[PDB]
Design a protein around this ligand. Structure first.
Ligand code: NA
Ligand code: NA
Ligand code: NA
Ligand code: NA
Ligand code: NA
Ligand code: NA
Length: 267
């Protein structure tokens, strides 16, 4: 029934600890710890499954993947599909690896969402899900979030990540699978109070930096609507330039969040 998430951190703990220990089994999502009694042949979890020393040693040495204990057995939070191999990586919080792809982390997503300050009663567009962390943070403020994910395997990996749970627990957030450049075309004009645009790097996602795309972002924003465009330069240049060309105003760097904000006029 319950899933116990375990990474190298927990396995090392259990191989080197004695008797019984209190450990966190949802990847620090909920701060709660549970007792796992240690035996010679392995560790038995709060469900009664014994993960044998063999398994814990294996995962104690593999610090590059998340594991979980579901029903009878232990499992690896990964998926083989199409031409890529995706896996959840035991960072805090977890990150996704697609064959091989990318206080620091969770503050960074709060800095991003802080640029546009989504409020209760507002609708936000998050153009590139990833694991959903920006979409979730924007929804925890009270806004209704639409978030686009191109890769159905990213969505499936998000599904077993306890940190992406709010993408799927009812509503507050709605997940569109598809191509963001094409999806935004089928959005109605003046739909969104804020847009958070966090695309892949220029060289791999040039069309998400195009005037054509920015015009679509412009069209679908409400008057007075807010845009954050991540940048992470010479492209910041064009981004700022192309956003004004398209209609945006208040276009400026936000240094903390490594991006550009903009505001659609005619409030
Ligand atoms: Na496996
Ligand atoms: Na507001
Ligand atoms: Na995003
Ligand atoms: Na995200
Ligand atoms: Na989040
Ligand atoms: Na796209």
């Amino acid at each position: 029934e319950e899933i116990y998430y375990i990474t190298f951190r927990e396995a090392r703990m259990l191989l080197a600890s004695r008797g019984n220990v209190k450990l966190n089994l949802d990847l620090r999502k909920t701060n709660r710890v549970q007792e796992v009694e240690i035996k010679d042949e392995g560790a038995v979890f709060p469900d009664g499954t014994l993960v044998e020393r063999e398994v814990l040693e294996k995962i104690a040495r593999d610090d590059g993947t998340v594991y979980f204990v579901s029903n009878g057995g232990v499992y690896k939070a990964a998926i083989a599909g199409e031409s890529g191999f995706y896996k959840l990586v035991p960072t805090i919080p977890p990150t996704i690896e697609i064959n091989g792809i990318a206080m620091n982390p969770l503050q960074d997503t709060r800095n991003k969402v802080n640029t546009v300050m989504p409020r209760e009663g507002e609708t936000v567009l998050d153009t590139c899900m990833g694991l959903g962390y920006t979409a979730i943070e924007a929804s925890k403020r009270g806004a209704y979030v639409i978030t686009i994910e191109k890769d159905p395997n990213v969505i499936e990996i998000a599904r077993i990540n306890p940190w992406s749970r709010e993408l799927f627990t009812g509503g507050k957030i709605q997940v569109i699978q598809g191509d963001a450049f094409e999806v935004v075309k089928k959005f109605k004009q003046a739909s969104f109070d804020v847009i958070i645009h966090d695309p892949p790097r220029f060289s791999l996602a040039g069309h998400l930096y195009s005037e054509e795309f920015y015009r679509e972002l412009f069209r679908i924003l409400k008057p007075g609507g807010r845009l954050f465009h991540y940048v992470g330069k010479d492209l910041q240049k064009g981004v700022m330039e192309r956003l004004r060309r398209v209609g945006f105003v208040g276009v400026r760097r936000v240094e903390e969040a490594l991006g550009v904000v903009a505001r659609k006029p005619e409030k």
